[PDB]
Design a protein around this ligand. Structure first.
Ligand SMILES: [Mg+2]
Ligand SMILES: [Mg+2]
Ligand SMILES: [Mg+2]
Ligand SMILES: [Mg+2]
Ligand SMILES: [Mg+2]
Ligand SMILES: [Mg+2]
Ligand SMILES: [Mg+2]
Ligand SMILES: [Mg+2]
Ligand SMILES: [Mg+2]
Ligand SMILES: [Mg+2]
Ligand SMILES: [Mg+2]
Ligand SMILES: [Mg+2]
Ligand SMILES: [Mg+2]
Ligand SMILES: [Mg+2]
Ligand SMILES: [Mg+2]
Ligand SMILES: [Mg+2]
Ligand SMILES: [Mg+2]
Ligand SMILES: [Mg+2]
Ligand SMILES: [Mg+2]
Ligand SMILES: [Mg+2]
Ligand SMILES: [Mg+2]
Ligand SMILES: [Mg+2]
Ligand SMILES: [Mg+2]
Ligand SMILES: [Mg+2]
Ligand SMILES: [Mg+2]
Ligand SMILES: [Mg+2]
Ligand SMILES: [Mg+2]
Ligand SMILES: [Mg+2]
Ligand SMILES: [Mg+2]
Ligand SMILES: [Mg+2]
Ligand SMILES: [Mg+2]
Ligand SMILES: [Mg+2]
Ligand SMILES: [Mg+2]
Ligand SMILES: [Mg+2]
Ligand SMILES: [Mg+2]
Ligand SMILES: [Mg+2]
Ligand SMILES: [Mg+2]
Ligand SMILES: [Mg+2]
Ligand SMILES: [Mg+2]
Ligand SMILES: [Mg+2]
Ligand SMILES: [Mg+2]
Ligand SMILES: [Mg+2]
Ligand SMILES: [Mg+2]
Ligand SMILES: [Mg+2]
Ligand SMILES: [Mg+2]
Ligand SMILES: [Mg+2]
Ligand SMILES: [Mg+2]
Ligand SMILES: [Mg+2]
Ligand SMILES: [Mg+2]
Ligand SMILES: [Mg+2]
Ligand SMILES: [Mg+2]
Ligand SMILES: [Mg+2]
Ligand SMILES: [Mg+2]
Ligand SMILES: [Mg+2]
Ligand SMILES: [Mg+2]
Ligand SMILES: [Mg+2]
Ligand SMILES: [Mg+2]
Ligand SMILES: [Mg+2]
Ligand SMILES: [Mg+2]
Ligand SMILES: [Mg+2]
Ligand SMILES: [Mg+2]
Ligand SMILES: [Mg+2]
Ligand SMILES: [Mg+2]
Ligand SMILES: [Mg+2]
Ligand SMILES: [Mg+2]
Ligand SMILES: [Mg+2]
Ligand SMILES: [Mg+2]
Ligand SMILES: [Mg+2]
Ligand SMILES: [Mg+2]
Ligand SMILES: [Mg+2]
Ligand SMILES: [Mg+2]
Ligand SMILES: [Mg+2]
Ligand SMILES: [Mg+2]
Ligand SMILES: [Mg+2]
Ligand SMILES: [Mg+2]
Ligand SMILES: [Mg+2]
Ligand SMILES: [Mg+2]
Ligand SMILES: [Mg+2]
Ligand SMILES: [Mg+2]
Ligand SMILES: [Mg+2]
Ligand SMILES: [Mg+2]
Ligand SMILES: [Mg+2]
Ligand SMILES: [Mg+2]
Ligand SMILES: [Mg+2]
Ligand SMILES: [Mg+2]
Ligand SMILES: [Mg+2]
Ligand SMILES: [Mg+2]
Ligand SMILES: [Mg+2]
Ligand SMILES: [Mg+2]
Ligand SMILES: [Mg+2]
Ligand SMILES: [Mg+2]
Ligand SMILES: [Mg+2]
Ligand SMILES: [Mg+2]
Ligand SMILES: [Mg+2]
Ligand SMILES: [Mg+2]
Ligand SMILES: [Mg+2]
Ligand SMILES: [Mg+2]
Ligand SMILES: [Mg+2]
Ligand SMILES: [Mg+2]
Ligand SMILES: [Mg+2]
Ligand SMILES: [Mg+2]
Ligand SMILES: [Mg+2]
Ligand SMILES: [Mg+2]
Ligand SMILES: [Mg+2]
Ligand SMILES: [Mg+2]
Ligand SMILES: [Mg+2]
Ligand SMILES: [Mg+2]
Ligand SMILES: [Mg+2]
Ligand SMILES: [Mg+2]
Ligand SMILES: [Mg+2]
Ligand SMILES: [Mg+2]
Ligand SMILES: [Mg+2]
Ligand SMILES: [Mg+2]
Ligand SMILES: [Mg+2]
Ligand SMILES: [Mg+2]
Ligand SMILES: [Mg+2]
Ligand SMILES: [Mg+2]
Ligand SMILES: [Mg+2]
Ligand SMILES: [Mg+2]
Ligand SMILES: [Mg+2]
Ligand SMILES: [Mg+2]
Ligand SMILES: [Mg+2]
Ligand SMILES: [Mg+2]
Ligand SMILES: [Mg+2]
Ligand SMILES: [Mg+2]
Ligand SMILES: [Mg+2]
Ligand SMILES: [Mg+2]
Ligand SMILES: [Mg+2]
Ligand SMILES: [Mg+2]
Ligand SMILES: [Mg+2]
Ligand SMILES: [Mg+2]
Ligand SMILES: [Mg+2]
Ligand SMILES: [Mg+2]
Ligand SMILES: [Mg+2]
Ligand SMILES: [Mg+2]
Ligand SMILES: [Mg+2]
Ligand SMILES: [Mg+2]
Ligand SMILES: [Mg+2]
Ligand SMILES: [Mg+2]
Ligand SMILES: [Mg+2]
Ligand SMILES: [Mg+2]
Ligand SMILES: [Mg+2]
Ligand SMILES: [Mg+2]
Ligand SMILES: [Mg+2]
Ligand SMILES: [Mg+2]
Ligand SMILES: [Mg+2]
Ligand SMILES: [Mg+2]
Ligand SMILES: [Mg+2]
Ligand SMILES: [Mg+2]
Ligand SMILES: [Mg+2]
Ligand SMILES: [Mg+2]
Ligand SMILES: [Mg+2]
Ligand SMILES: [Mg+2]
Ligand SMILES: [Mg+2]
Ligand SMILES: [Mg+2]
Ligand SMILES: [Mg+2]
Ligand SMILES: [Mg+2]
Ligand SMILES: [Mg+2]
Ligand SMILES: [Mg+2]
Ligand SMILES: [Mg+2]
Ligand SMILES: [Mg+2]
Ligand SMILES: [Mg+2]
Ligand SMILES: [Mg+2]
Ligand SMILES: [Mg+2]
Ligand SMILES: [Mg+2]
Ligand SMILES: [Mg+2]
Ligand SMILES: [Mg+2]
Ligand SMILES: [Mg+2]
Ligand SMILES: [Mg+2]
Ligand SMILES: [Mg+2]
Ligand SMILES: [Mg+2]
Ligand SMILES: [Mg+2]
Ligand SMILES: [Mg+2]
Ligand SMILES: [Mg+2]
Ligand SMILES: [Mg+2]
Ligand SMILES: [Mg+2]
Ligand SMILES: [Mg+2]
Ligand SMILES: [Mg+2]
Ligand SMILES: [Mg+2]
Ligand SMILES: [Mg+2]
Ligand SMILES: [Mg+2]
Ligand SMILES: [Mg+2]
Ligand SMILES: [Mg+2]
Ligand SMILES: [Mg+2]
Ligand SMILES: [Mg+2]
Ligand SMILES: [Mg+2]
Ligand SMILES: [Mg+2]
Ligand SMILES: [Mg+2]
Ligand SMILES: [Mg+2]
Ligand SMILES: [Mg+2]
Ligand SMILES: [Mg+2]
Ligand SMILES: [Mg+2]
Ligand SMILES: [Mg+2]
Ligand SMILES: [Mg+2]
Ligand SMILES: [Mg+2]
Ligand SMILES: [Mg+2]
Ligand SMILES: [Mg+2]
Ligand SMILES: [Mg+2]
Ligand SMILES: [Mg+2]
Ligand SMILES: [Mg+2]
Ligand SMILES: [Mg+2]
Ligand SMILES: [Mg+2]
Ligand SMILES: [Mg+2]
Ligand SMILES: [Mg+2]
Ligand SMILES: [Mg+2]
Ligand SMILES: [Mg+2]
Ligand SMILES: [Mg+2]
Ligand SMILES: [Mg+2]
Ligand SMILES: [Mg+2]
Ligand SMILES: [Mg+2]
Ligand SMILES: [Mg+2]
Ligand SMILES: [Mg+2]
Ligand SMILES: [Mg+2]
Ligand SMILES: [Mg+2]
Ligand SMILES: [Mg+2]
Ligand SMILES: [Mg+2]
Ligand SMILES: [Mg+2]
Ligand SMILES: [Mg+2]
Ligand SMILES: [Mg+2]
Ligand SMILES: [Mg+2]
Ligand SMILES: [Mg+2]
Ligand SMILES: [Mg+2]
Ligand SMILES: [Mg+2]
Ligand SMILES: [Mg+2]
Ligand SMILES: [Mg+2]
Ligand SMILES: [Mg+2]
Ligand SMILES: [Mg+2]
Ligand SMILES: [Mg+2]
Ligand SMILES: [Mg+2]
Ligand SMILES: [Mg+2]
Ligand SMILES: [Mg+2]
Ligand SMILES: [Mg+2]
Ligand SMILES: [Mg+2]
Ligand SMILES: [Mg+2]
Ligand SMILES: [Mg+2]
Ligand SMILES: [Mg+2]
Ligand SMILES: [Mg+2]
Ligand SMILES: [Mg+2]
Ligand SMILES: [Mg+2]
Ligand SMILES: [Mg+2]
Ligand SMILES: [Mg+2]
Ligand SMILES: [Mg+2]
Ligand SMILES: [Zn+2]
Lengths: 53, 64
RNA sequence: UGAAAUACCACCCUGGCGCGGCUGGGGGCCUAACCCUCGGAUGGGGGGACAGCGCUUGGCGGGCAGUUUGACUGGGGCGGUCGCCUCCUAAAAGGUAACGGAGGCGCCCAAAGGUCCCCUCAGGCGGGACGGAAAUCCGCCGGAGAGCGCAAGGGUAGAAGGGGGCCUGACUGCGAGGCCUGCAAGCCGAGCAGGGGCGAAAGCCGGGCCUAGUGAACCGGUGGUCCCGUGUGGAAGGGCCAU
RNA sequence: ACCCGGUGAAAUUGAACUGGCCGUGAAGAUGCGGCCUACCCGUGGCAGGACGAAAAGACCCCGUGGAGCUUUACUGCAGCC
RNA sequence: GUGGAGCCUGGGAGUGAGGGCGCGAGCGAUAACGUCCGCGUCCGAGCGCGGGAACAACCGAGACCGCCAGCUAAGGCCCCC
RNA sequence: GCUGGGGCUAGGAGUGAAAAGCUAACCGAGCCCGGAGAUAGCUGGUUCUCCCCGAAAUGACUUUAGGGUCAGCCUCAGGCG
RNA sequence: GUAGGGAAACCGAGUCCGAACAGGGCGCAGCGGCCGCAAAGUCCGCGGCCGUGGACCCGAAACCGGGC
RNA sequence: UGGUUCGUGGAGCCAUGGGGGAAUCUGGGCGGACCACCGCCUAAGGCUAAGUACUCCGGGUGACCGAUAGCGCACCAGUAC
RNA sequence: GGGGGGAACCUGGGGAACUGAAACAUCUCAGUACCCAGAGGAGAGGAAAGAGAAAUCGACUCCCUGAGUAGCGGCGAGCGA
């Protein structure tokens, strides 16, 4: 982690709860991460969006 | 005069029915982003303090 | 005739002036609080709503006050050092010290991750426009001396190296059993369930060839949860999960 | 100062029946070993030793000891604005 | 292999200044009664006993008490002895 | 200039032709009583007898290093065998 | 002391995490021929050691208050 | 600001140095911010035995001392100094 | 009528520090020591603008208990209804 490599949360698109924390290099990957992850509230896989930590 | 209960122990620890001392795992208070789900999960459990340290802590809780 | 259309009576906008209500600053003057003074004082004079003094705001402040001002160390100081990784010292299990000998870390990668499929190096010689010791091409030899992001070591092509397709397991809920170990930490982990990825399948997948890339509590932030809620319903404020 | 008559302290002091050398020993021995030397007891003198006396080293270091002092160390306070 | 062996639970500690020697290394100078680890040992706590002239740790040997008895150990057997 | 008598100023205070001088024979903060048996991880000291066992001076961590906590090593009771 | 588990609501020989009827954590349990005995536990005495007090005894330099 | 278990905390209650400043039961304070509901209580005047504290004084009694003990003092002692 | 005195005890007005936190500042020691005013054989307090959840209790003081609980706390040391 640094200034260029940030920490971030992954928010489930369907219920809005933050289920994961991870990182990215925001110079190499300036767009918000979107990733399918298992949401334990929805109890199914769901697109998660990068959200500020 | 009578002993006072140590309140830092009383707020961190429990004596079980059989006289073990149980506390919360350390290490997930912060800096968690890069910790695996395995580490976060297993740190959510209680654990039994080693016997030497459990004996000392129980002496701090004379009325539990 | 436009969106609205007309005389006339309302309420109220815009903005302005003028009278006053009311108060904010400033300028001036006044005296009587308050202060100074005057053989004389229920008075005269001077200052004057300032100054002084009360409460409160922020500031300057060794004049003074309480203290702090680390350890290791061939004495102490000075210099260096302080955690973590690799090798050696280390006496063929493990461990093992010195201000012993050498180097590195405080990152990184959205692929440099998962899976399926395919591929194989460095180097030497010979041959080939610009083209060279070395650019790219062809042939022969070449088991690993290349590569694997970065130190070193171990490991490694019967791939952990190179390329491509589809992907997000860089999972959630757990966890038999162990390694290590004073504690607390740190490490490895089959297997079961949930919902998935790749594969025809057997299967693999809970990040990365591996070992550094890190920080216990306390205090506080943010998202969620809807567990507590000081007579009751709420609320304030907490707890729990995540960061 | 010394001798006689009178009066008569002190620090110090484990106990002592308390010699030299060469060795040894916690590394400078009257006290251990070997050897040498040495009849018993005083008096006046000299200071090499008894690591002689005095003062629980002032130097030096150590103690998460103290105190005085300094400042653009920290945090307050008086004072002043 | 029955030993002041071992394992489990609990009560009480003390110690956390080590030191010599032998061997294996590092540091030092193939120096130090030097220094820092490892294996062992003794002194520490066996300054109890014999030997080594004397002498914590070298050699011999683990002192319950008594004997004017015997055998040995290291080391010794010309005199001190 | 020196000096008698009579007075005034004191403890973070006085006084000082300035030496941190002096303030009742030791002043970088007087003396007395009190808080008070301050605190001292330091030094010293710790008192009858016999019997059995019998250490440690290491590791980790420590504003820690001559102090501690845990472990190691000693001991006692019960249990196992 | 006779119930524990859970932050808690709460449930209870269980409970907590969990979607779980999964897995795991913490819990849950007499000898004899009815009477004995022996026992939870608890009370009191005694002894070791620990906590609070000066806490084995003596010892500062100092700090503070009120006076002289 | 103080008091309280409450150290600014969600900080109520009781007290009050400063500023502002009511009402008379349809008044007012409280039940831990606050609001509603439901209740409790009557502030800004005063007094009030007893149960409680102490021991200069008197008495009684000690698994209390016995002249370095016990009060500092058994005695012409808060004296001598 | 007051004044002054009285061993402790009591109330009010002021109010430390060593120390503890193994440093130290908040915190602790402690509203203690001590200074002062006053009281009396006692003093203070006292007849709910109380408590706080009982559809409840019924001045105050004092003992036991509640309870080292609830809580407070560099959520430390500790403090403590
Ligand atoms: Mg606490
Ligand atoms: Mg934690
Ligand atoms: Mg933390
Ligand atoms: Mg958290
Ligand atoms: Mg948090
Ligand atoms: Mg990672
Ligand atoms: Mg993970
Ligand atoms: Mg994660
Ligand atoms: Mg979880
Ligand atoms: Mg209880
Ligand atoms: Mg209980
Ligand atoms: Mg004028
Ligand atoms: Mg005038
Ligand atoms: Mg005038
Ligand atoms: Mg004028
Ligand atoms: Mg003014
Ligand atoms: Mg103001
Ligand atoms: Mg101000
Ligand atoms: Mg300053
Ligand atoms: Mg100063
Ligand atoms: Mg202090
Ligand atoms: Mg400091
Ligand atoms: Mg420091
Ligand atoms: Mg040092
Ligand atoms: Mg040096
Ligand atoms: Mg050295
Ligand atoms: Mg040295
Ligand atoms: Mg030296
Ligand atoms: Mg330096
Ligand atoms: Mg470490
Ligand atoms: Mg090794
Ligand atoms: Mg090795
Ligand atoms: Mg080895
Ligand atoms: Mg091992
Ligand atoms: Mg060094
Ligand atoms: Mg470096
Ligand atoms: Mg790719
Ligand atoms: Mg080639
Ligand atoms: Mg060529
Ligand atoms: Mg060419
Ligand atoms: Mg070429
Ligand atoms: Mg290679
Ligand atoms: Mg590199
Ligand atoms: Mg691939
Ligand atoms: Mg791929
Ligand atoms: Mg697809
Ligand atoms: Mg295990
Ligand atoms: Mg462990
Ligand atoms: Mg590690
Ligand atoms: Mg599955
Ligand atoms: Mg599946
Ligand atoms: Mg599948
Ligand atoms: Mg398929
Ligand atoms: Mg499958
Ligand atoms: Mg797996
Ligand atoms: Mg990699
Ligand atoms: Mg890879
Ligand atoms: Mg890595
Ligand atoms: Mg880690
Ligand atoms: Mg803290
Ligand atoms: Mg919190
Ligand atoms: Mg919440
Ligand atoms: Mg609720
Ligand atoms: Mg309420
Ligand atoms: Mg409520
Ligand atoms: Mg409502
Ligand atoms: Mg409700
Ligand atoms: Mg609401
Ligand atoms: Mg809430
Ligand atoms: Mg968390
Ligand atoms: Mg004569
Ligand atoms: Mg004479
Ligand atoms: Mg003699
Ligand atoms: Mg003689
Ligand atoms: Mg010699
Ligand atoms: Mg000598
Ligand atoms: Mg000699
Ligand atoms: Mg002699
Ligand atoms: Mg002799
Ligand atoms: Mg001899
Ligand atoms: Mg001799
Ligand atoms: Mg001799
Ligand atoms: Mg002789
Ligand atoms: Mg001679
Ligand atoms: Mg003579
Ligand atoms: Mg002489
Ligand atoms: Mg002379
Ligand atoms: Mg001599
Ligand atoms: Mg001499
Ligand atoms: Mg001399
Ligand atoms: Mg001398
Ligand atoms: Mg002497
Ligand atoms: Mg002394
Ligand atoms: Mg000395
Ligand atoms: Mg000295
Ligand atoms: Mg001296
Ligand atoms: Mg000096
Ligand atoms: Mg020195
Ligand atoms: Mg010093
Ligand atoms: Mg320090
Ligand atoms: Mg220290
Ligand atoms: Mg100091
Ligand atoms: Mg000082
Ligand atoms: Mg001072
Ligand atoms: Mg034995
Ligand atoms: Mg033994
Ligand atoms: Mg046996
Ligand atoms: Mg034991
Ligand atoms: Mg015992
Ligand atoms: Mg004992
Ligand atoms: Mg020790
Ligand atoms: Mg110890
Ligand atoms: Mg030590
Ligand atoms: Mg040592
Ligand atoms: Mg030593
Ligand atoms: Mg050693
Ligand atoms: Mg040493
Ligand atoms: Mg040796
Ligand atoms: Mg050796
Ligand atoms: Mg040999
Ligand atoms: Mg050799
Ligand atoms: Mg050697
Ligand atoms: Mg070596
Ligand atoms: Mg030479
Ligand atoms: Mg040596
Ligand atoms: Mg040597
Ligand atoms: Mg050597
Ligand atoms: Mg040795
Ligand atoms: Mg010793
Ligand atoms: Mg021996
Ligand atoms: Mg021995
Ligand atoms: Mg011997
Ligand atoms: Mg000896
Ligand atoms: Mg002998
Ligand atoms: Mg001998
Ligand atoms: Mg001999
Ligand atoms: Mg001999
Ligand atoms: Mg010897
Ligand atoms: Mg020797
Ligand atoms: Mg024997
Ligand atoms: Mg014979
Ligand atoms: Mg022989
Ligand atoms: Mg001979
Ligand atoms: Mg003979
Ligand atoms: Mg005069
Ligand atoms: Mg005069
Ligand atoms: Mg005079
Ligand atoms: Mg004057
Ligand atoms: Mg004066
Ligand atoms: Mg005075
Ligand atoms: Mg003074
Ligand atoms: Mg004073
Ligand atoms: Mg002062
Ligand atoms: Mg002054
Ligand atoms: Mg003068
Ligand atoms: Mg005097
Ligand atoms: Mg003088
Ligand atoms: Mg001073
Ligand atoms: Mg002073
Ligand atoms: Mg004087
Ligand atoms: Mg006094
Ligand atoms: Mg005190
Ligand atoms: Mg003292
Ligand atoms: Mg001190
Ligand atoms: Mg004693
Ligand atoms: Mg024995
Ligand atoms: Mg050690
Ligand atoms: Mg540690
Ligand atoms: Mg450290
Ligand atoms: Mg260390
Ligand atoms: Mg040190
Ligand atoms: Mg040292
Ligand atoms: Mg120490
Ligand atoms: Mg221990
Ligand atoms: Mg053993
Ligand atoms: Mg036994
Ligand atoms: Mg509970
Ligand atoms: Mg839950
Ligand atoms: Mg279960
Ligand atoms: Mg079980
Ligand atoms: Mg019975
Ligand atoms: Mg019983
Ligand atoms: Mg104990
Ligand atoms: Mg005490
Ligand atoms: Mg004391
Ligand atoms: Mg005591
Ligand atoms: Mg004690
Ligand atoms: Mg003094
Ligand atoms: Mg002080
Ligand atoms: Mg001071
Ligand atoms: Mg004074
Ligand atoms: Mg207020
Ligand atoms: Mg307050
Ligand atoms: Mg307060
Ligand atoms: Mg709070
Ligand atoms: Mg409050
Ligand atoms: Mg209210
Ligand atoms: Mg007021
Ligand atoms: Mg008020
Ligand atoms: Mg009413
Ligand atoms: Mg009203
Ligand atoms: Mg009120
Ligand atoms: Mg109010
Ligand atoms: Mg109320
Ligand atoms: Mg009556
Ligand atoms: Mg009365
Ligand atoms: Mg009464
Ligand atoms: Mg009485
Ligand atoms: Mg009497
Ligand atoms: Mg008697
Ligand atoms: Mg008698
Ligand atoms: Mg007498
Ligand atoms: Mg007497
Ligand atoms: Mg007598
Ligand atoms: Mg007496
Ligand atoms: Mg008397
Ligand atoms: Mg007399
Ligand atoms: Mg008066
Ligand atoms: Mg008076
Ligand atoms: Mg009176
Ligand atoms: Mg008062
Ligand atoms: Mg007054
Ligand atoms: Mg006061
Ligand atoms: Mg008072
Ligand atoms: Mg004061
Ligand atoms: Mg203090
Ligand atoms: Mg103290
Ligand atoms: Mg204390
Ligand atoms: Mg303490
Ligand atoms: Mg302290
Ligand atoms: Mg301390
Ligand atoms: Mg200090
Ligand atoms: Mg302090
Ligand atoms: Mg206080
Ligand atoms: Mg008193
Ligand atoms: Mg009076
Ligand atoms: Mg009475
Ligand atoms: Mg009264
Ligand atoms: Mg009254
Ligand atoms: Mg009334
Ligand atoms: Mg109770
Ligand atoms: Mg208090
Ligand atoms: Zn969701």
């Amino acid at each position: 982690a640094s200034e260029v490599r940030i920490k971030l949360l992954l928010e489930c698109t369907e219920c809005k709860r933050r289920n994961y924390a991870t990182e990215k290099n925001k110079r190499n990957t300036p767009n918000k991460l979107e990733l399918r992850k298992y949401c334990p509230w929805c109890r199914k896989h769901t697109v998660h969006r990068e959200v500020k930590i | 005069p009578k002993m006072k209960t140590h309140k830092g122990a009383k707020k961190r620890v429990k004596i079980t029915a059989s006289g073990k001392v149980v506390a919360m795992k350390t290490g997930k208070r912060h800096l968690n982003w890069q910790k695996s789900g395995k580490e976060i999960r297993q740190k959510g459990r209680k654990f039994v303090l080693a016997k030497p340290e459990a004996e000392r802590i129980k002496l701090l809780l004379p009325y539990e």
